Amino acid sequence: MKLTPGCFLWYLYMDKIYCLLSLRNVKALMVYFHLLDVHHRNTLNDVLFFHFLQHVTNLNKSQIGMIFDLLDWTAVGEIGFDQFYVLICILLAHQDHLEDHFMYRHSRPVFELLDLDGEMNIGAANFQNYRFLFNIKKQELRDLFHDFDITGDRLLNYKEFKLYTIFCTDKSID
Amino acid sequence: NMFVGVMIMHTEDSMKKFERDLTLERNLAIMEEKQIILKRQQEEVNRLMNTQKSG
Amino acid sequence: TANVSVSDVCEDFDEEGKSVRNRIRKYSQTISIRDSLNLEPEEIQQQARRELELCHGRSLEHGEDHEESETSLASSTSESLIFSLWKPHRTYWTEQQNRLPLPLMELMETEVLDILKKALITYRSTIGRNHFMTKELQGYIEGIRKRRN
């Protein structure tokens, strides 16, 4: 198989969702994950993940720890190969201008990445974590939160988040 | 007791209408900003269609 | 030592249909001319970039792939990445033409396998979470992997 049928379908979905499918990006990510995972137990330690983040993206230690905590939903103290691949695809050279539109497109559900609690609601801590992950002004984030909170309860539903993402994508395309 | 009750909900009924008017003004501003956004989007769509027709 | 087959490394990997062997031969001829004329490295790189741009910029009516290639080469970062990808592949094909495979490749493979085994043992066995030697070994392994990648 071409590195499992599930990952093949994920690569096909990424190619259908992105203008450029690159060349062996998933293979390079798998090679980097194999290099990071010393024991080759399909998992990586927090220290190894922070070392890889400092070597590649040169992110802060607190930001790397927050990203690892958000990615590892199992809370087992380790990050899997699939989690590392998902994080790499979410980053996708975030310094580029088109990476902002790629992150606005996000993924198929495009809600659970922001909703760390998982109760179909994104809080102020989740908004701050998203603003730490992707650079954005605090005033702009507050204005976006106020615009999204139509009911004034400071809670974002899945349909409201989808509508906001669609409006942002339409504004960016136009 | 009559003085305290009279004052209590005289001020309650005074600020209730004030807060309702302030929330109505905020809702009017929100509706107007949504209308401006919609008109801007429609103008952008029409301009894109005109450019595609003329190109 | 790329340790790759010449027939797989020069199988016209370019999507424009241009001959990779002919492009490498033209690049080698240009490099020989520059070496005879004592050209500087910056001028040599500029000439190689111009040659790659000319190879990509064929007649624009013969397919829109050439126009897209020229538009990509008109940039800086994408053009530099394309030139770097073409130059390493050209060097690998040129080395594989005459005689690439040779000794010390098995030595490098054995060294990589030994490093992987040592890293696996160190990651599997960790008695002390606050120990210094294990942390230093893991950090050195991570740095070596980052430098290799």
Swiss-Prot record, chain A:
**Could you give a GO molecular-function term held by this entry?**
calcium ion binding
Q: Which residues form the EF-hand domain?
A: 59-94, 100-135, 136-171
Q: Where does the chain bind Ca(2+) 1?
A: N60, S62, D69
**Keywords recorded for this protein, A-Z:** Calcium, Calmodulin-binding, Cell projection, Cilium, Cytoplasm, Differentiation, Flagellum, Metal-binding, Repeat, Spermatogenesis
One GO process term, biological-process aspect: flagellated sperm motility
On tissue specificity, the annotation reads: Testis-specific.
Impact after mutating D72N: Reduced interaction with CATSPERZ due to defects in Ca(2+)-binding
Please tell me one Gene Ontology term that the record gives under cellular component.
Answer: CatSper complex
Explain the consequences of disrupting this gene.
Mice are normal but males show severe male subfertility despite normal sperm morphology. Subfertility is caused by defects in sperm motility: spermatozoa have a lower basal level of intracellular calcium and aberrant Ca(2+) homeostasis.
Tell me where on the tree of life, at the top rank, the source sits: Eukaryota
Q: Is this entry keyworded DNA-binding? A: no
- Protein location: Cytoplasm; Cell projection, Cilium, Flagellum
Effect upon mutating E160Q? Reduced interaction with CATSPERZ due to defects in Ca(2+)-binding
Positions contributing to Ca(2+) 2 binding: D149, D153, E160
The primary site where this protein sits is cytoplasm
Quaternary organization: Component of the CatSper complex or CatSpermasome composed of the core pore-forming members CATSPER1, CATSPER2, CATSPER3 and CATSPER4 as well as auxiliary members CATSPERB, CATSPERG2, CATSPERD, CATSPERE, CATSPERZ, C2CD6/CATSPERT, SLCO6C1, TMEM249, TMEM262 and EFCAB9. HSPA1 may be an additional auxiliary complex member. The core complex members CATSPER1, CATSPER2, CATSPER3 and CATSPER4 form a heterotetrameric channel.
Function noted in UniProt: Auxiliary component of the CatSper complex, a complex involved in sperm cell hyperactivation. pH-dependent Ca(2+) sensor required to activate the CatSper channel. Sperm cell hyperactivation is needed for sperm motility which is essential late in the preparation of sperm for fertilization. Associates with the CatSper complex via direct interaction with CATSPERZ, and senses intracellular Ca(2+). Together with CATSPERZ, associates with the CatSper channel pore and is required for the two-row structure of each single CatSper channel.
Swiss-Prot record, chain B:
Subcellular location(s): the record lists: Cell projection, Cilium, Flagellum membrane
Q: What is the consequence of disrupting this locus?
A: Mice are normal but males are sterile. Male sterility is due to defects in sperm motility unability to fertilize intact eggs.
Tissues in which the protein is found: Testis-specific.
Q: Which domain of life is it from?
A: Eukaryota
Q: Which family does it belong to?
A: Belongs to the cation channel sperm-associated (TC 1.A.1.19) family.
Assembly and interaction partners = Component of the CatSper complex or CatSpermasome composed of the core pore-forming members CATSPER1, CATSPER2, CATSPER3 and CATSPER4 as well as auxiliary members CATSPERB, CATSPERG2, CATSPERD, CATSPERE, CATSPERZ, C2CD6/CATSPERT, SLCO6C1, TMEM249, TMEM262 and EFCAB9. HSPA1 may be an additional auxiliary complex member. The core complex members CATSPER1, CATSPER2, CATSPER3 and CATSPER4 form a heterotetrameric channel.
Q: What does this protein do?
A: Pore-forming subunit of the CatSper complex, a sperm-specific voltage-gated calcium channel that plays a central role in sperm cell hyperactivation. Controls calcium entry to mediate the hyperactivated motility, a step needed for sperm motility which is essential late in the preparation of sperm for fertilization.
Q: What is this protein called?
A: Cation channel sperm-associated protein 3
The organism's taxonomy opens as: Eukaryota, Metazoa, Chordata, Craniata, Vertebrata
Mapped onto the parent protein, the portion here is: 261 to 315 of 395
UniProtKB/Swiss-Prot annotation, chain C:
Record protein name field: Cation channel sperm-associated auxiliary subunit zeta
Please describe what happens when the gene is knocked out. Mice are normal but males show severe male subfertility. Mutant males display fragmented patterns of CatSper complex stripes in the tails of their sperm, leading to a reduction of calcium ions that pass through the channels to enter the cell. As consequence, the sperm tail is more rigid, preventing it from moving efficiently within the female. Mutant sperm are less able to penetrate the egg than normal sperm.
Q: How the protein assembles, per its UniProt entry?
A: Component of the CatSper complex or CatSpermasome composed of the core pore-forming members CATSPER1, CATSPER2, CATSPER3 and CATSPER4 as well as auxiliary members CATSPERB, CATSPERG2, CATSPERD, CATSPERE, CATSPERZ, C2CD6/CATSPERT, SLCO6C1, TMEM249, TMEM262 and EFCAB9. HSPA1 may be an additional auxiliary complex member. The core complex members CATSPER1, CATSPER2, CATSPER3 and CATSPER4 form a heterotetrameric channel.
Its annotated compartments are: Cell projection, Cilium, Flagellum membrane
Summed up, the tissue specificity of this protein is: Testis-specific. Expressed in adult but not in fetal testis. Not expressed in ovary. Within testis, expression is restricted to spermatids.
Q: Main role?
A: Auxiliary component of the CatSper complex, a complex involved in sperm cell hyperactivation. Sperm cell hyperactivation is needed for sperm motility which is essential late in the preparation of sperm for fertilization. Required for a distribution of the CatSper complex in linear quadrilateral nanodomains along the flagellum, maximizing fertilization inside the mammalian female reproductive tract. Together with EFCAB9, associates with the CatSper channel pore and is required for the two-row structure of each single CatSper channel.
Q: Name one GO biological process term.
A: sperm capacitation
Q: Which residues of the full protein are shown?
A: 38 to 186 of 194
Is Membrane found in the keyword set? Answer: yes
